[PDB]
Design an enzyme around this catalytic site. Sequence first.
Site, PDB file in Angstrom:
ATOM      1  N   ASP A  27     112.503  86.322  80.854  1.00 25.74           N
ATOM      2  CA  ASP A  27     112.977  85.974  82.185  1.00 25.74           C
ATOM      3  C   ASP A  27     111.832  85.518  83.078  1.00 25.74           C
ATOM      4  O   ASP A  27     111.064  86.346  83.590  1.00 25.74           O
ATOM      5  CB  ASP A  27     113.673  87.190  82.800  1.00 25.74           C
ATOM      6  CG  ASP A  27     114.259  86.900  84.172  1.00 25.74           C
ATOM      7  OD1 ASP A  27     114.383  85.719  84.540  1.00 25.74           O
ATOM      8  OD2 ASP A  27     114.615  87.859  84.881  1.00 25.74           O
ATOM      9  N   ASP A  65     113.668  78.897  85.786  1.00 24.64           N
ATOM     10  CA  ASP A  65     114.204  80.233  85.495  1.00 24.64           C
ATOM     11  C   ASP A  65     114.947  80.335  84.165  1.00 24.64           C
ATOM     12  O   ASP A  65     116.123  79.946  84.051  1.00 24.64           O
ATOM     13  CB  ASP A  65     115.140  80.664  86.625  1.00 24.64           C
ATOM     14  CG  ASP A  65     115.594  82.096  86.481  1.00 24.64           C
ATOM     15  OD1 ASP A  65     114.995  82.819  85.649  1.00 24.64           O
ATOM     16  OD2 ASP A  65     116.566  82.471  87.176  1.00 24.64           O
TER      17      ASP A  65
END
Length: 373
Positions: free
Chosen positions: A34, A220
């Site tokens: 992440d 992201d």
Amino acid sequence: FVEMVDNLRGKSGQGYYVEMTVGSPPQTLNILVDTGSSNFAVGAAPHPFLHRYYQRQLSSTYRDLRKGVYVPYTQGKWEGELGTDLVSIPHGPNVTVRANIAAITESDKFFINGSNWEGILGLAYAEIARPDDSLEPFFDSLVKQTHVPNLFSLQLCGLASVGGSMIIGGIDHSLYTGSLWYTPIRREWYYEVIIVRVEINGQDLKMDCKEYNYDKSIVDSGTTNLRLPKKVFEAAVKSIKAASSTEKFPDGFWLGEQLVCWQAGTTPWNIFPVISLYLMGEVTNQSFRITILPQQYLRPVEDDCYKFAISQSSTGTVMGAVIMEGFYVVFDRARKRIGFAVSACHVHDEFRTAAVEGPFVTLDMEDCGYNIP
Ligand SMILES: CC(C)(C)CCNC(=O)CCc1cc2cc(-c3ccccc3C#CCC3(NC(=O)c4ccc(F)cc4)CC3)ccc2nc1N
């Protein structure tokens, strides 16, 4: 870096995870990769969704920091106990580091029932770590304690299983084609970037470029879609609708709430436009563009059926997995820049080719940045 190639897995719409080990003796866990958060946090109690969880009392090298951590998100949370332990990545560099670890003991809306990951590896910067920016993120610890270079790169290759590579400490030339172009990291919190122009089939969207980054733009791996600020999303959808108007779609399709299907192999890829995002370059008044094919923004789901994977945002642009699946992305933290090149594993179009191309001349690019007061 051959040992790290193909070290990522996942399932459709569930993210990409890497194998890691924590503690002594090593406990193996699968960990979501992440770039939009900055905590290393692992299930540490038997939540019913988990294949397994960290058992901190079985590790001789676990140190309790005697401090709690609580992370709320959209009426969900994760919560637990902070400590440190020895951490390794088996298909990564041949090193072990003592890193901060959040042992998650209670959570809501965090773990996914049916996923094969048990924790999260937040690769963004300390500013967005919880409980505060004094909790050193994993990658910072890795770089501080070893000779691993301060960069990593991601090739995400698009339930149906999924795969990819996280190259820790370098770049593997085999994972891209063409040239690698870099955009500055505007600020070290999220991996924040500045979009300076958007085109649909070469047609300028013609908005004030500030709108593209209202109130930020981030890269992201923790988000599936390309998410666009409301005003930009509406302009983009209007243009994509116009381009594809020879077919009718339900209103819900454009909201990602229903599928559109075609007979096996008759998907009219030609009627869906390519989208070019121009990013601030390394040089004054210089930009480059990345071009995504419709094969990126129409996600396949089980005729050939697809979901529209561009969605509206109220918290800025998010270049999610959708975009990242088109490109080899280099997070060059050492030089505060992010590189893009066409991915060697992106899904091809019959007649059009994805690109990362430059240079372009774009004036006043600083004005494209939004200033959050
Ligand atoms: C504010 C906080 C630090 C929590 C996150 C800031 N980042 C963002 O808002 C960007 C989106 C994002 C949201 C996140 C939310 C949380 C979170 C915190 C508490 C309770 C629930 C959550 C959550 C969630 C969704 C999530 N992502 C996925 O499940 C996922 C699905 C598909 C993908 F392709 C990639 C990831 C598991 C992180 C954790 C990490 C996150 N990581 C992210 N990149």
